[PDB]
Amino acid sequence: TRTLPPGVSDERFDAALQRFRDVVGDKWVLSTADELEAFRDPYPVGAAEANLPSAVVSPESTEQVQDIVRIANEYGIPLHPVSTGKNNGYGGAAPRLSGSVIVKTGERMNRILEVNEKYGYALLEPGVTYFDLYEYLQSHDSGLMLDCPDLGWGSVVGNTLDRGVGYTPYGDHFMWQTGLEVVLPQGEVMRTGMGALPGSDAWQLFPYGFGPFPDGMFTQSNLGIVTKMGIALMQRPPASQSFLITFDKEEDLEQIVDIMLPLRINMAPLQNVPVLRNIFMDAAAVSKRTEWFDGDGPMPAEAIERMKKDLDLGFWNFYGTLYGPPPLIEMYYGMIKEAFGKIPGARFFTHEERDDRGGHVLQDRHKINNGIPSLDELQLLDWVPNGGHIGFVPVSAPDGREAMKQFEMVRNRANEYNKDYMAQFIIGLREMYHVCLFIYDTADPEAREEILQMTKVLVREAAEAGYGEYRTHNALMDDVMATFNWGDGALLKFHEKIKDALDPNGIIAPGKSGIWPQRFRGQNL
Amino acid sequence: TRTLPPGVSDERFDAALQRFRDVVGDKWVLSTADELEAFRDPYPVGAAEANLPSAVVSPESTEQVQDIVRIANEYGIPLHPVSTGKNNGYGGAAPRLSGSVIVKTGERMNRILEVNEKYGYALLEPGVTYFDLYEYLQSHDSGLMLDCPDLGWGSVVGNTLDRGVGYTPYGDHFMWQTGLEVVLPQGEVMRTGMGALPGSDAWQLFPYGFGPFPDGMFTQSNLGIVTKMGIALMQRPPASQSFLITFDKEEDLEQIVDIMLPLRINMAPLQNVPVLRNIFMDAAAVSKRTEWFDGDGPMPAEAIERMKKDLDLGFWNFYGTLYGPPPLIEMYYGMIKEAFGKIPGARFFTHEERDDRGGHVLQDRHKINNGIPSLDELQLLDWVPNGGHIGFVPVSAPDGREAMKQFEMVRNRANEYNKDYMAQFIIGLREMYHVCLFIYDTADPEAREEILQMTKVLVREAAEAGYGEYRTHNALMDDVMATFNWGDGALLKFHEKIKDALDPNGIIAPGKSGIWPQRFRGQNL
Ligand SMILES: *Cc1cc2c(cc1C)nc1c(=O)[nH]c(=O)nc-1n2C[C@H](O)[C@H](O)[C@H](O)COP(=O)(O)OP(=O)(O)OC[C@H]1O[C@@H](n2cnc3c(N)ncnc32)[C@H](O)[C@@H]1O
Ligand SMILES: *Cc1cc2c(cc1C)nc1c(=O)[nH]c(=O)nc-1n2C[C@H](O)[C@H](O)[C@H](O)COP(=O)(O)OP(=O)(O)OC[C@H]1O[C@@H](n2cnc3c(N)ncnc32)[C@H](O)[C@@H]1O
Ligand SMILES: C=CCc1ccc(O)c(OC)c1
Ligand SMILES: C=CCc1ccc(O)c(OC)c1
């Protein structure tokens, strides 16, 4: 049928749509079923339809965002703000609440407002992609570098606002985010930090401004629609070298983590954000599943062995990058070589020492860790026909026993639900994201429903072991926020009071992070 | 006269006090004029008395804080929460609103709950002073170091909660704060980050947890009473060396800042938070005003020259610390010498090469920058009889012109109001605090009132040049928050709805950072 906002008639919605068209122009409101299918979750989860958009609106300016918000308030139309809407693995551009309108800020608000060489920052509109920014930096011959995630088509703004991560020293995007401009849920515009002081040049210099520090409350949040964002850019070091360490055994995970933490916590010699990818993760990047195993079932141990031998990779594959003058890079690599060399079967390769298929991932990490955005890692989705992923990412202490327990808990459930377990340990200073990508056939309703049920079990089971996810998909947001229920759901109750204060009509992205406004609370979604 | 909360009778206040005694014990509630005088602002601003506490309550469990907040809600008693209450230059323990009850959490909640060597963090109760933490690190022979402000008698928690600053690479206290436990304004307890997930080991490992990031909203805020807070501790490097660069001329400020920025933005070779102190600031630390000038009125040029000659300092004095193996320190120091050496009159001294009276500041900075707390800088308040200070701290871009333009704006007003202008530029990566201390005779109303009117003009004047302060005194919080009025006071209105949602009875520290709850708005308060 026609997809409508909850409790909005065909009559009110057509009226709301015409008002939208009056603000942004006829060409920049999408509302037909055929055109709207590009904005559904490319990696859908569950058998039944979920997260359907009623319309897509593409404003050009802050003021247009204001009027769109003002219209939504009058007609009770829920608004789902996105930038480039490439949140793939977490719902893409699809809104949490079926029937919501996508506000695609990125389509036409895509200008690089400023790139300041002296102070090393960028002021961006949501539409500026990692590729967009890299092209700017290269063309203007910049000494600065950006920090990208695995896929470069994302928004520097959009990624920050869901607290996504990169892999250079500037990997923590929210940390380096400096100032923003947001349209609050009833259409008022506000600037944070020094942007709040008229005429200040310090908007991108000093994050905090004066009084309570709000910026964080607009990340993984439904408290507004962001129209501008500042971020800090690191200067490109004079040289760099990337390396791979293959580890033969599954049980090697324990010592890898335990050896890694002393080398990582002081940001030297492990300067970048190290990643520890399993053989499944790496194999999927360069090959199809059917190359190794033709059956329907958890892959047998001999099949795993073929992947390792043929790709010349270990069960665990450590990828790092070193920066600075060659002598410093030499000393740091020397230290890494001999800390990790204490593990039987460890083998060491630099980005200059491997041109084979197996070294494709090392060559890609070398680009990502040097602020060169890539799409090469889209090849993962060729693992199986109509390939999709969901991201189940629990946060772990950098401890080999915690890491082993998590590895074994997840592989256990993946085998049960007949999904390949692909893992990438992203290592911060004192914490670790255990990235589990589950790749499945999107066109097969049982794969979708198996993915949904399996991850709901893993959310619950991880919680009973004392682990939470940093970020999750539309389908798991209620299940994930339910796990942060210390003091009888104290945190959700806190977020609920603020959402109802700023958004009294419950307009902005209802259900985001399991945070529902009053008019939707207890309403079976 | 007995000091009472606004609109609360003696009978109703006596009842509230007795209820407080039933919770904390009668010996931990102070309500008599004589005992309350210790809790006045030690550095009072303006002639008329202001910021008078009605009572002081010292709970020693979260459970007691909850009960006290619930009582305050019943009786409409305003609560001002403090840790050690040593916020000197900004009001000390004194509440913004006259009549408020101080909740001194630090008196009895003063336990180090954990210090973890492996992950390098501490979980602290508000009462733990920098001296307390240092003592612990030393007793247990820890490899970690803390990051303290200039005065070590404050709270690690309390300092963080006002976004205070230290001078080690971990100088950004809020940045390294990881998890907290807060009592919300109606008595409910909440844990943030991974603390919100029951049984998680990652509370002090991963700050963000899931969904919106709230921790910042409890800094320079009146949204609750913090009972526990995590902070990361940096590993003590193998060696360190501290240095002083004296610059002879006032006008040298420009080239110093311009030369500093390239050396600072990459955290090397300026690894430390550098401070640039003027000859007044350093003179005050080791000598009284009457050693140079027994006159009344701004200090003459020959007196300024005598200070420089006698202390063997310049007008501007640069104080840095270098960390790591001696070869690394030696190369960094080499770079700093020929960069700054381009300024005519620059001179260099290491902490090992100066034991004269002028080098006390250098010896004190060497302590502070290595995580060794100090009170040596209390000598600053002997400048004049009954000395107190206020902190006027505008944020400045690391631009020589901008630093210069501020320097003259402030000195201009200081001379007009017959206050000596003492400056310490604290230099972050891409931003500087222009710390302006005004030292004055707290015992004469003219001096107090001259300080109040001068800092009001300097707030207003700095705003018209596009500069805002990062932190301010009780007396200036409305004037300061008034300057951040982009979008027609957009920022304050946002804060106000959050305060009103979480605090419908307007209990917690009304007027903090110029943020008043409903019942006080437009009330000459
Ligand atoms: C499939 C996949 C995904 C992936 C990845 C590898 C693969 C194979 N590697 C990632 C990585 O290394 N790091 C990372 O952070 N994410 C990674 N992903 C996930 C995803 O592809 C990327 O994170 C991607 O960059 C996110 O998409 P995009 O950048 O386009 O973000 P968005 O969809 O526009 O917005 C994300 C959410 O933020 C909120 N939002 C966005 N804009 C606004 C505005 N203007 N106002 C308010 N809220 C906004 C919304 O919640 C939105 O959904
Ligand atoms: C006079 C002076 C001051 C000074 C300084 C040098 C001199 C000569 N050098 C400083 C420095 O280098 N860095 C810095 O950050 N401050 C410096 N100061 C100022 C002062 O000495 C310190 O900032 C001091 O550490 C602050 O006092 P303290 O640490 O005792 O903080 P507090 O009074 O306990 O609390 C501060 C405010 O935070 C809120 N607060 C505190 N505790 C709580 C709890 N538990 N819950 C909720 N809110 C809390 C209040 O708003 C309180 O006013
Ligand atoms: C190959 C890395 C994938 C990846 C990294 C971080 C993420 O948050 C994520 O979410 C879907 C996926
Ligand atoms: C002598 C340094 C003083 C100092 C440093 C940081 C501050 O915030 C401050 O405020 C009063 C004072």
Residue numbers in the entry:
A (entry chain D), B (entry chain A): 2 to 526
Paper lines:
In this work, we engineer EUGO, a VAO-type oxidase, to catalyze the selective dehydrogenation of 4-n-propylguaiacol to isoeugenol. Similar to VAO, EUGO is active on various 4-substituted phenols and contains a covalently bound FAD. The oxidation of 4-alkylphenols starts with a hydride transfer from the Cα atom of the substrate to the N5 of the flavin cofactor. Consequently, a p-quinone methide is formed and stabilized in the active site. This reactive intermediate can subsequently be hydroxylated by the base-catalyzed attack of water, or tautomerise to the dehydrogenation product.
To shed light on the effects of the introduced mutations on the enzyme structure, the crystal structure of the S394V-EUGO5X mutant in complex with 4-n-propylguiacol was solved at 2.9 Å resolution. The asymmetric unit comprises eight enzyme subunits forming four compact dimers. The overall three-dimensional structure of the mutant is virtually identical to that of the wild protein as revealed by an RMSD of 0.49 Å for 526 Cα atoms. The pattern emerging upon investigating these stabilizing mutations is clear: four of them (S81H, A423M, H434Y, S518P) create a better side chain packing by presenting bulkier or rigid aliphatic groups, whilst the fifth mutation (I445D) substitutes a hydrophobic residue with a charged one on the protein surface, and might contribute to overall stability by preventing protein aggregation and/or exposing a more hydrophilic side chain in direct contact with the solvent. The sixth (S394V) mutation of S394V-EUGO5X promotes enhanced chemoselectivity towards isoeugenol formation by favouring substrate dehydrogenation over hydroxylation. V394 is located at the entrance of the cavity where the substrate binds. Notably, this position represents the connection point between the active site and the wide chamber located at the subunit interface, which may comprise the entry passage of the water molecule which is used by EUGO to hydroxylate the reactive quinone methide intermediate. Therefore, a reasonable explanation for the higher chemoselectivity and reduced hydroxylation featured by the S394V-EUGO5X mutant is that the more hydrophobic and tightly sealed cavity of the S394V enzyme may hinder the accessibility of the Cα atom of the p-quinone methide intermediate to water, limiting the formation of the unwanted alcohol side-product. Specifically, careful inspection of the electron density revealed that the substrate is covalently bound to FAD in two of the eight crystallographic subunits present in the asymmetric unit, whilst in the other chains, the ligand was found to be non-covalently bound. By comparing the subunits with covalent and non-covalent bound substrates, we found that covalent binding is associated with a 20° tilting of the bound substrate.
